[PDB]
Design a protein around this ligand. Sequence first.
Ligand SMILES: Nc1ncnc2c1ncn2[C@@H]1O[C@H](COP(=O)(O)OP(=O)(O)OP(=O)(O)O)[C@@H](O)[C@H]1O
Lengths: 212, 733, 295
Amino acid sequence: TFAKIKFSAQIRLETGLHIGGSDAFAAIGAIDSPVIKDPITNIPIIPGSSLKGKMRTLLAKVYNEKVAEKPSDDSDILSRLFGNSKDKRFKMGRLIFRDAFLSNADELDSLGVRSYTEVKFENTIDRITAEANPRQIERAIRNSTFDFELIYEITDENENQVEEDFKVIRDGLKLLELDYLGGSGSRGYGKVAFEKLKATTVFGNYDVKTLN
Amino acid sequence: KEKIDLFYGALLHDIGKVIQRATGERKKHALVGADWFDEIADNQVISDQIRYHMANYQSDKLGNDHLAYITYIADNIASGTNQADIFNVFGAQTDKRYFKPTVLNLKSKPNFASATYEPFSKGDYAAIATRIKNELAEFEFNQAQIDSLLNLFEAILSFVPSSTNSKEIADISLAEHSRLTAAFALAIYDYLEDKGRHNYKEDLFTKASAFYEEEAFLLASFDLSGIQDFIYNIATSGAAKQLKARSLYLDFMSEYIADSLLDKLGLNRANLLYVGGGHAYFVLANTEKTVETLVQFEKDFNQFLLANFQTRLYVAFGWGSFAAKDIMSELNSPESYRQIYQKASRMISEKKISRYDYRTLMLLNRGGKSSERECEICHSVENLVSYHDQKVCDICRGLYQFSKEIAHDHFIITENEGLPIGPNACLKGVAFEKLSQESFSRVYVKNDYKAGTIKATHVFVGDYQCDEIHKYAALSKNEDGLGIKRLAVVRLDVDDLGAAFMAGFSRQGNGQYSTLSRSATFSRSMSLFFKVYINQFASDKKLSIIYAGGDDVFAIGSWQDIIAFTVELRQNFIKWTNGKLTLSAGIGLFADKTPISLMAHQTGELEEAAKGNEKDSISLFSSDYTFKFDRFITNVYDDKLEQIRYFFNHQDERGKNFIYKLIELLRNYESEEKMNVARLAYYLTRLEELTDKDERDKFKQFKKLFFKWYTNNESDRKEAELALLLYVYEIRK
Amino acid sequence: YKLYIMTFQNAHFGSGTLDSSKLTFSADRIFSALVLESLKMGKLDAFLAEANQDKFTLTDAFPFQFGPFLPKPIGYPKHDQIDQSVDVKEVRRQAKLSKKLQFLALENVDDYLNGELFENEEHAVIDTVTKNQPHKDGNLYQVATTRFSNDTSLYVIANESDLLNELMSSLQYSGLGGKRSSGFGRFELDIQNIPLELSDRLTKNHSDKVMSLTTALPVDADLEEAMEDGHYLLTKSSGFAFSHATNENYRKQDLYKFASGSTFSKTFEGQIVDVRPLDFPHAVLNYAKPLFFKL
Ligand SMILES: Nc1ncnc2c1ncn2[C@@H]1O[C@H](COP(=O)(O)OP(=O)(O)OP(=O)(O)O)[C@@H](O)[C@H]1O
């Protein structure tokens, strides 16, 4: 009738990415947009808006039936999983995300590393001169786990389509690993890896069997 | 007609002092002033009051109930060797400064007080009495004109004192003494008429503390709330162009309260003590007639503001009776003078929390609207109209038309032509044509030079616009390739305000230092610097000042000139106050195309965060750079930030690969203390080895100065983070 | 009666505009959330007959840092306590510190009325994040977040029953206020039994200089009778409605209530106002059930 399906997993970054944060106050040792961190401490974190804005775009191009143009108005078979401000059949999003915090600090200081974010030197070639615009970026370190929990809940009517919903979510998790997740990922910066993909219940109203 | 003669009789009561100080003649100022005024003007009642100003004259009485008998009591209220400094009698005894009677003009440079003039007296000047006699040819003073002379009397005589004698009475200028003495004269006429008797206007106050002990005055004040919540707070970023018109909307609203209240009761402009920023101090009388007027006025002024506006804008009055014996003669205790303001400011905090009452609060909770169309500017749905991409309502609709009306020199107050600001009044922007011109016109920064037959009751307010608002991103970057496409916002606000107004002038038991005139000249001396001198100092810059008041300002624009204006404006304030009043602010950059709500709110949180230490602190780009401001222009901006501009500019591209790492070392100091010191010795050798051999002669002292600034003081370590950050933002991209 | 301790981490609670945010939120946010999720479970008609039972009430979000916190009394103290009279500048500069204060400690509820002024403890800092959209003319927007620190938690006091504990069990895994479609609302419910022996002065009968909280709202039969000689502060709380059968979502009418910590004199009643602009198949409910503290 009403269950709470939580998809607890650990995001393992096999390649350092780069996501532009807010202003430059926590990392002013760069020339472009730095990576957002924590305003209290000093741990590189990733917001939850980047997980929904990227997974929905890469998923609405294979499970669609019409050429899209504007958000919240393409492929009704998957619009009920994110959100829609036009259809009356559904409004709320049944896939609550969470800001993935870096929980790898419990064993990172024992090995002795540099810090938390490195600086990479990049430039461009105008095919008429040598080095042009000596800029630089700020990527993330390698091997850093995170806490990603996907909340799923039914609303009574969710009855004769629960088994079909797991096919889209499971296919969307493995599809994100084969694509970059960040900025300027065309050269190979993103590419995540969902480690220990498991699902459990909190309220207790639906048995677990479709674990993998 | 009968009561208006008393107002003009107290303004020119010392008109003969200017001629005496300019032309050598052994005559009194009260005797030569009546003869010089009668030569060009054909009057008689106002001429007898000039001769009967003092008490040792009596030209054969001539008059039983004449109005020339109450001018001596009101003269001692506003009263108590070139020109004594106002800020000199505040705090301790420092340096003795003196002004200079020049010409007050917006384009002219300010004459700061110093100790290099003539400590003797004035001399033989002719640049003051010449302009007075030139425009003296005016028709009979009637009701058609009110502020046709007060706007010029205080625009040239602002640097001329009144009655040069001793030291207690010398810091009061003649332009303010003659203006303040007319307010107390009108209260006596209203007190002697509301009661019943009339033969008292002669000679019955034999006792020194007779009329001075009886309470016959009233101190009125208000607190217009909703200034920072209506101007700074905004919805979308499309209201950036009309933000200057939004600031001028509430600026004339506070001036309309002073005009509608004094004209309805039957007074003039003398009953005014600095109106601006939602704070003023009105003077009245202790009569039952003046009380019934302010009660009905506050109930009707808040009536029309409930339909168009909401609960943001609210005006709460505050009265407080007092006596005239609290600012003269006996009673030298500081609590005696402070009790006058406590009788009116106490109800201010009580009336603002007790706004509406019965049969008023339930009107807003009725409900009758059912539509989904808002202006997305101020969150209000009331009489909308089409415009551009959105549908503007009616509250923020008049700001678009008024934004283009800023270039107009005159502001005609109409009835229903545009956007109404009062009960049955309005305001528009047009000039050089005069399509109607109802009554009471207002202009902006109109001093001397430009003066003719205008006749307008105006005030002073800052107004300066560079090039729009939403385009300072391109002006911050030069043509070569330096700077960023961002902008900064500073909010310079005065720190201490309870002193130099309540009880702070006490230093000697001789002088009382509690006269209302001594406390009234403090607001007038600082209003010329925070509301008039701002437009002159912001010239030739890539910024535009907005809301130039005596409290908090709002300067927006490119940071290429704001940084050079914030630290420079405080330097002119220290010399004007002899270093007795501190100042604090905060400069913070933001992004382009951002909502002004959080853009003006995040820069305001740094103001409160810059007061945790004591009072003379500062907050830079973030809340971590907590310094003392004085250590910036004398150390950081002096021999730190400037030294890098000519001792490191020769190294480019390859040489600019070490500043980004040295900043990170300055932060990691608590967990890495001694280990970080050993790593600093390695970065100082990588820059010297990776350069030209002939260029090494320039890099010879920066290594020792940078290492000493790291192990000396905890507060000194944060100074290097600010110098290395301003250098990267200079030349980049 | 029974407090529900819960801590927040990177949340969002706007007040007036979406870009702005505050550290706390009004009491109408909690009441308008449990009713909206009751229809998704299958017991919307069960909670409707429970909120209108007088004894059932809710409290505002009060901070909890090694002890429960309470709002400051509006208008208190009066003009009688000066707190170390030294100079007019030192007394005037410290009076504003109490005005900017948000909440007082549970042990300072009696010492503040006798003469004590201090700066409020730094609970958290206001931090903002930025977002945009690449495939829509490159537009962008700015929103603010609330990142608590130094063990900053909240708590709400309600009534113990066998139905309320199950409705709030799913709220911790469903968001609460702000951007719900991102993860700005997830928390953890820390259940407890014994509240505190000092915070048991919640009464609704006698009137001995009480203090209304959770945005009071007098009834039409008792408005000016309890408004005269009191201390309050009008606020603002509105916004677009959220329904599933309107195709327009009409704007809810304004309800200018009060603030948390207003001191009146008598005891109110507390009603439930219905917000119906044009027409709706349901009814927009509202809390408006202020409590009282003996002080
Ligand atoms: N230009 C001015 N001329 C005269 N009085 C002014 C001016 N600006 C402000 N004031 C006075 O300042 C008072 C408000 O002061 P406020 O409470 O803002 O100071 P404050 O913020 O407490 O100072 P601090 O930050 O040092 O504590 C008003 O009552 C007003 O009369």
